[PDB]
Design an enzyme around this catalytic site. Structure first.
Site, mmCIF file in Angstrom:
data_model
loop_
_atom_site.group_PDB
_atom_site.id
_atom_site.type_symbol
_atom_site.label_atom_id
_atom_site.label_comp_id
_atom_site.label_asym_id
_atom_site.label_seq_id
_atom_site.Cartn_x
_atom_site.Cartn_y
_atom_site.Cartn_z
ATOM 1 N N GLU B 353 0.816 -1.210 0.000
ATOM 2 C CA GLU B 353 0.000 0.000 0.000
ATOM 3 C C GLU B 353 0.851 1.263 0.000
ATOM 4 O O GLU B 353 0.450 2.276 -0.582
ATOM 5 C CB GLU B 353 -0.943 -0.007 1.200
ATOM 6 C CG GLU B 353 -1.927 -1.157 1.187
ATOM 7 C CD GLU B 353 -2.827 -1.135 -0.031
ATOM 8 O OE1 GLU B 353 -3.152 -0.029 -0.512
ATOM 9 O OE2 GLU B 353 -3.207 -2.222 -0.512
ATOM 10 N N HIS B 483 -16.414 -10.059 -12.269
ATOM 11 C CA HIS B 483 -15.915 -9.095 -13.244
ATOM 12 C C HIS B 483 -16.751 -9.067 -14.518
ATOM 13 O O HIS B 483 -16.870 -8.013 -15.154
ATOM 14 C CB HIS B 483 -14.459 -9.402 -13.580
ATOM 15 C CG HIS B 483 -13.539 -9.254 -12.413
ATOM 16 N ND1 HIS B 483 -13.566 -10.111 -11.333
ATOM 17 C CD2 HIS B 483 -12.580 -8.337 -12.145
ATOM 18 C CE1 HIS B 483 -12.656 -9.732 -10.454
ATOM 19 N NE2 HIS B 483 -12.042 -8.659 -10.923
HETATM 20 ZN ZN LIG Z 1 -2.659 -2.578 -4.771
#
Ligand SMILES: [Zn+2]
Ligand SMILES: *[C@@H]1O[C@H](CO)[C@@H](O)[C@H](O)[C@H]1NC(C)=O
Ligand SMILES: *[C@@H]1O[C@H](CO)[C@@H](O)[C@H](O)[C@H]1NC(C)=O
Ligand SMILES: *[C@@H]1O[C@H](CO)[C@@H](O)[C@H](O)[C@H]1NC(C)=O
Ligand SMILES: [Cl-]
Lengths: 12, 592
Positions: B353, B483
């Site tokens: 992150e 998706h």
């Molecule tokens: Zn990521």
């Protein structure tokens, strides 16, 4: 969510 | 320059300032809700997020007053192009209303999907956690078959007529925006025009995906053959030594990843996986220590510290939504939201992150719309290589989570590479074949009466996976994946995967790394950090082909670095398979 995009600038 | 270009530059200057202010305010509301879930904030954030979505529509209208043909400055062209997009506005109001109704209904059918006990029709299972637990953990062939079939029968059949009209309406929209079809429209994310030596056409993506997949086939066929022999011991009498893998035996509802096959295929089950969770709890590590170590890693390669606002504003522990997310609000405000725990996973995720944050900080000076990844695959590839370096025994020793005398034996190395390959390599045929099917459908190359026939011919041929029961054209098995039913392009999971090993190999060569690529740690290498930063700061102001060249020295997607990363496993697999068939006949099926 908000994005620096014109296609998908917004998601709730 | 010309009057039209000057007026466009002035317009964009005002757009970029107006967008910064409204985006900061809008995303400031997103941070409030996601860190303090209240009933008021759901619509309060909607009040801020709806204000943001309409502003871009008005600014899009203003952008149309400047013909793109008159702009010669490429940086201005790139911004005007993103603003001038019409999207679903080209559709009549009836067709837009219909498409949106179809889109919302498919999404709702998927997210409310559930299957019920046929003997007890009030006892029902949702995908998460119910069916997913069966698909991951069940060793009962018939229970796995029941969950796999019931999901596609209950959910997929509901989506079939909706998906047909979705294809029609999406193609009409794409054609009216001067694309060939909706698939061609999605491939526009990789398009580059007007930069000599760095151009990239939308069709070239199909050829580059197909060429790099060709080179993946030997490694995947050998992984497949090893898994197939191990699965014969896990599900005796149900798997042919020369045939495809039954689709319901792959560890999740689709076989998108083979991750959950690990305990059934582990090469050396007596060698436990390297885990520093206990060593962290022993040394009294908290969430603050994790991100501080992550910051030390990025500082170690020449990237900046985190900002004062980062530490002041970021929520690093559960006091909210707990998805690990990186926030780029503008005006120098960067944050991470993560309900961190003292585990090895969250230590790796924090490096991932913060890689997003480093990417965000590096291109913060770019114009508003160019503050993004070079293409859809870049950002996650940047985050992934951070976990690759941070997870190596080499790096875990340097931060004192492994004893200084720790040596990883070659059986533990093979276990790790196989576990890596079940996730990373196993998904590549799945991802390419699914997107290929959609691309061909949008192109009109697969008639409706052959949709499912071709889906399973391609599953057998490309993926080596076979349906355990025959499916006629009432089914819509693709749409049974989130998706597909939720209208998201998929090839990003293929390109991102190849990008991340292109990045890592180049960074590890810059750091002059010795030994197998998978053992590399780019820590304390300022040359690797400078190579990476030369692409990070570009945002999407330059062609993605140029941004890739800034890291790895070549302009195009390349699968050879991924093959190099898995070379020790490839060698071991060929030896394991010397008395097995490698590859598959598409003629066998569990039912015929
Ligand atoms: Zn990521
Ligand atoms: C395009 O305009 C920007 C300012 O908006 C300028 O910095 C840039 O140099 C211009 N392009 C070229 C090729 O000079
Ligand atoms: C958007 O639609 C309008 C009206 O049909 C058209 O004049 C304009 O050229 C379109 N813009 C693009 C980028 O296609
Ligand atoms: C980086 O260098 C510092 C200072 O010499 C050292 O303490 C640290 O262990 C090194 N880390 C790695 C991964 O080499
Ligand atoms: Cl399927």
């Amino acid at each position: 969510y908000v994005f620096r995009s014109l296609r998908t600038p917004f998601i709730v | 320059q010309s009057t039209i270009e000057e007026q466009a530059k002035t317009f964009l200057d005002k757009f970029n300032h107006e967008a910064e202010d409204l985006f900061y305010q809008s995303s400031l509301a997103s941070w409030n809700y996601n860190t303090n879930i209240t009933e008021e904030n759901v619509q309060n954030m909607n009040n801020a997020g709806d204000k943001w979505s309409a502003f871009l529509k008005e600014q899009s209208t203003l952008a149309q007053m400047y013909p793109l043909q008159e702009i010669q400055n490429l940086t201005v062209k790139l911004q005007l192009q993103a603003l001038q997009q019409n999207g679903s506005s080209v559709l009549s109001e009836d067709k837009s209303k219909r498409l949106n109704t179809i889109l919302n209904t498919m999404s709702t059918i998927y997210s409310t999907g559930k299957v019920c006990n046929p003997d007890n029709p009030q006892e029902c299972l949702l995908l998460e956690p119910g069916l997913n637990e069966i698909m991951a953990n069940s060793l009962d062939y018939n229970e796995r078959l029941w969950a796999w079939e019931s999901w596609r029968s209950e959910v997929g059949k509901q989506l079939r007529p909706l998906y047909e009209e979705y294809v029609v309406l999406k193609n009409e929209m794409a054609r009216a925006n001067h694309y060939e079809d909706y698939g061609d429209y999605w491939r526009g994310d990789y398009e580059v025009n007007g930069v000599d030596g760095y151009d990239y056409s939308r069709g070239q993506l199909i050829e580059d995906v197909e060429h790099t997949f060709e080179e993946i086939k030997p490694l995947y066929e050998h992984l497949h053959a090893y898994v197939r022999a191990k699965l014969m011991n896990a599900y005796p009498s149900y798997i042919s030594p020369i045939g495809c893998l039954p689709a319901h035996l792959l560890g999740d509802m689709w076989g998108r990843f083979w991750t959950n096959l690990y305990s059934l295929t582990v090469p050396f089950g007596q060698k436990p996986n390297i885990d520093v969770t206990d060593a962290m709890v022993d040394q009294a590590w908290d969430a603050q220590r994790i991100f501080k170590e992550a910051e030390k890693f990025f500082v170690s390669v020449g990237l900046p510290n985190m900002t004062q606002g980062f530490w002041e504003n970021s929520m690093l522990t559960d006091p909210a939504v707990c998805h690990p997310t990186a926030w780029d609000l503008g005006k120098g405000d960067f944050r991470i939201l993560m309900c961190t725990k003292v585990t090895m996973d969250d230590f790796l995720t924090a490096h991932h992150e913060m890689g997003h944050i480093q990417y965000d900080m590096a291109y913060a000076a770019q114009p508003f719309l160019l503050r993004n990844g070079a293409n859809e695959g870049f950002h996650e590839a940047v985050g992934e290589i951070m976990s690759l370096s941070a997870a190596t025994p080499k790096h875990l020793k340097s931060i004192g989570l492994l004893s200084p005398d720790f040596q990883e034996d070659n059986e533990t190395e093979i276990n790790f590479l196989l576990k890596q390959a079940l996730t990373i390599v196993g998904t590549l045929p799945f991802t390419y074949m699914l997107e290929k099917w959609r691309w061909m459908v949008f192109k009109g190359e697969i008639p409706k009466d052959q949709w499912m026939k071709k889906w399973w011919e391609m599953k057998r041929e490309i993926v080596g996976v076979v349906e355990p029961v025959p499916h006629d054209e009432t089914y819509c098995d693709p749409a049974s994946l989130f998706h597909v039913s939720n209208d998201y392009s998929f090839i990003r999971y293929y390109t991102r995967t190849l990008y991340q090993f292109q990045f890592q190999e180049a960074l590890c060569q810059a750091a002059k790394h010795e030994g197998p690529l998978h053992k590399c740690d780019i820590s304390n290498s300022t040359e690797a950090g400078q190579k990476l930063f030369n692409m990070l700061r570009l945002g999407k102001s330059e062609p993605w082909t140029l941004a890739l060249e800034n890291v790895v020295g070549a302009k195009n997607m390349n699968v050879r670095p991924l093959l190099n990363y898995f070379e020790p496993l490839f060698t071991w697999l060929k030896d394991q398979n010397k008395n097995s068939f490698v590859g598959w006949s598409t003629d066998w099926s569990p039912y015929a």
